[PDB]
Symmetry: C2
Subunit: 448 residues, 2 copies
């Protein structure tokens, strides 16, 4: 089954030559791209043909950190302002009322926002399982909306009966965690090229569980070929806690647990030291940059430019909607460029460097070689922005930079795994007005 | 004439009690607000009745710095990255081809972006006048789109062949600057309440003109009762240049020039020191905070929280579209909150403080008491965001914070001076797709100009 995107004003490929093709054309069969180029690919009819004049086509953005259940709890009044301590203490007793239907809908809500703002692959970090919630419920929602999903079995063990902050209803026994995590891997992990569903193992933070679960998790992930994800060094407290309790820097504590390698990626890394950047570069460890979260939570300016210069694989993440509180992937791309410039100078990040993090960087951090750019044999994952909107008026001097320097609206078109999921700005895979409405009634229900 | 906006989910007034009314209602006739309240107001006679169920109403956001002509020259490739020195030198020769029509259309383009993102009053800082352009051309476009406009006669005298970066076609004779400025005040400045047009005088920077032109300009604003605007201390260079040539801080050189007072407002002020903050606080001098520009140009994090604690009047600006490069007022409000928090901590700026900068603070910096919040006798300047979009899904726990912490789309409705200028997300005062087409059609002409 064939799909032809023809005569885009600018087809950004992100391929090995970083081709930016004027009048560029894209030919798809099934889930993969057959060729990127020009009018040469239009001479035969295709089962579907979509004119893309006046549009920029880019590879689909890849979101590499999230907490989609938190899209049910944005701007909770008690949590909008204050210290991360009050943030957790105010939000945990609420999240203790999450029901499996809420995980299933809240996955689609968060996913719809990312998709309409240009994202074709996302991870999630669901690490709470009250009232019979399961990673399966999140997966059911991802399958319905058609997004490429990296589901993380997040976990927590240290609750209030062990000196921790999470209530006891929101922690679990480490043996039950390893057993659910292995059941999830066996039931959902597709390791083949163009997989639409993959599992990674992901304790919430190296301090939310025992060191034994950190090591046992990595052993299991290595045995099964899945990735490892966690929160690492997102603020000053993280650094102090690691030095005070384990006498190590967060990077050193990470290396010590086996949690380095191209099958690992750490979220935030705002306070990664120079030695930790060197370590992550030579072992291939990835970082998920969450610039809006780092600002909205007063975490800091991660040394992203320092990491890229030294060779670190960096992807982009919006983080949970209680710590952003938006899910706008292209705006997060914009934000990474703005925040890097104000922290490190007028040469710290341009439009193409940001967009590369949001595409190739995310694929690398998720340990995937089949997404992130547009070339023969790659997954058919791309979006298209209308260039004649008011938002981009006067910015056609560079359609690629226009997306990062201006604030565009929704994408016009989106193709995930070869399937046209957004047409003229309308989500095709779900009844979006109905899901949004349902989402808001559960959020009202969850909060009261 | 009469208009009723009824049953909003949340009507945030920004009034003296900061009332945030559930089911809030707004009763307008002409340009006034006649009454603010609740269900009681449905007994009131109205010519037209507008249901705002599921919407949040906020007072219209007030933009206090711009360069609307630069919306024809966004993401210019040579200017996307590098030092401000390369930014100026790549963009000056381009802007030297501006025609009066380009000013007339780009003003509408720039204003439309602001209006669809929640802004009802904006100033501008047009400081180039090549090929017979005039501030009149800006004004013609503003009158057509219906936005409340504070038009600044920007000016520049220190150009090339005189030790400056602006080319010689983009400088002007200091006597002609004062003479066209007095013509603009006499012909356009409406000092009456609910004025839709006010003039302010605004040399580009204290160093872009002679000291005489700054003082003569300051005397004229005082003599005519108008305001004064300029860029002050936006970067390290600006501060060092002042210490080097005049042995003073930019705030000191400003006070030394007469350029302080409640009729003055300075853009950026990224490097204002503690004493200059105190100086601005006791003199009532205003600042226009421009967070996106401050980042996209690697200027720095301005100490807005320090200024508010000291009593400084702070408004918000998007700045010219070549140093942002967007014109989204609500996202600029969000951005000001994010950037203050990452610079100074989790208590440096909440949703309500940022929105207050975008409303009352913008009204104060402009020296206006008839806009900026919703109460009996205020101008009918407000917008309404649909709360049931995907962007705000799960954020109805606080509709006001939702506007700052999430990324909403365009407004659903907009009212400036009593005129419903946006209906169900659709701009009413111009043929927007057609103006957008012309805008891109002229920017192409400008960029391929011979230079
Ligand atoms: Zn997170
Ligand atoms: Zn400016």
């Amino acid at each position: 089954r064939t799909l032809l995107f023809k005569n885009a004003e600018l087809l950004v490929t992100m391929d090995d030559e970083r081709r930016e093709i004027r009048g560029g054309c894209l030919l798809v069969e099934g889930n993969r791209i057959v060729a990127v180029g020009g009018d040469e690919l239009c001479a035969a009819p295709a089962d579907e043909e979509i004119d893309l004049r006046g549009h920029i086509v880019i590879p689909g953005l890849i979101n590499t950190h999230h907490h989609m259940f938190q899209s049910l709890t944005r701007v909770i009044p008690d949590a909008q302002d204050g210290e991360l301590f009050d943030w957790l203490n105010n939000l945990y007793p609420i999240w203790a009322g999450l029901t499996p239907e809420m995980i299933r809908i809240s996955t689609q809500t968060a996913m719809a926002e990312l998709m309409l703002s240009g994202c074709t692959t996302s991870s999630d970090h669901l690490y709470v399982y009250p009232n019979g919630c399961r990673l399966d419920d999140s997966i059911d929602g991802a399958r319905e909306i058609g997004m490429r999903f990296h589901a993380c079995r997040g976990s927590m063990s240290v609750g209030r009966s062990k000196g921790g902050l999470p209530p006891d209803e929101l922690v679990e026994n480490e043996q039950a965690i390893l057993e659910d995590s292995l059941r999830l891997i066996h039931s959902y992990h597709d390791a083949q090229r163009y997989s639409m569903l993959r599992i990674a193992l992901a304790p919430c933070s190296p301090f939310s569980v025992s060191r034994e679960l950190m090591v046992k998790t990595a052993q299991m992930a290595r045995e099964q070929g899945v990735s490892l994800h966690t929160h690492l060094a997102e603020n000053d407290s993280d650094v102090s806690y690691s030095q005070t309790h384990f006498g190590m820097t967060p990077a050193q504590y990470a290396e010590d647990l086996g949690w380095v390698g191209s099958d690992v990626w750490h979220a935030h890394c705002v306070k990664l030291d120079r030695a930790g950047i060197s370590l992550f570069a030579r072992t291939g460890t990835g970082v998920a940059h969450c610039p809006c979260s780092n600002m909205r939570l007063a975490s800091g300016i991660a040394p992203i430019r320092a990491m890229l210069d030294e060779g670190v694989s960096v992807g982009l993440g919006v983080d949970g909607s209680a710590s952003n509180d938006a899910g706008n992937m292209i705006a997060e791309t914009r934000q990474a460029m703005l925040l890097q410039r104000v922290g490190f100078g007028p040469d710290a990040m341009n439009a193409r460097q940001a967009l590369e993090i949001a595409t190739r960087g995310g694929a690398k951090v998720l340990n995937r070689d089949d997404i992130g750019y547009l070339a023969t044999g790659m997954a058919a994952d791309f979006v298209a922005f209308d260039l004649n909107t008011l938002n981009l008026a006067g910015a056609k001097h560079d359609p690629l930079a226009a997306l990062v320097f201006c604030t565009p609206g929704n994408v016009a078109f989106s193709v995930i795994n070869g399937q046209v999921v957004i047409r003229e700005g309308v989500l095709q895979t779900i009844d979006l007005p109905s899901v949004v409405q349902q989402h808001n009634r559960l959020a009202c229900l969850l909060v009261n």
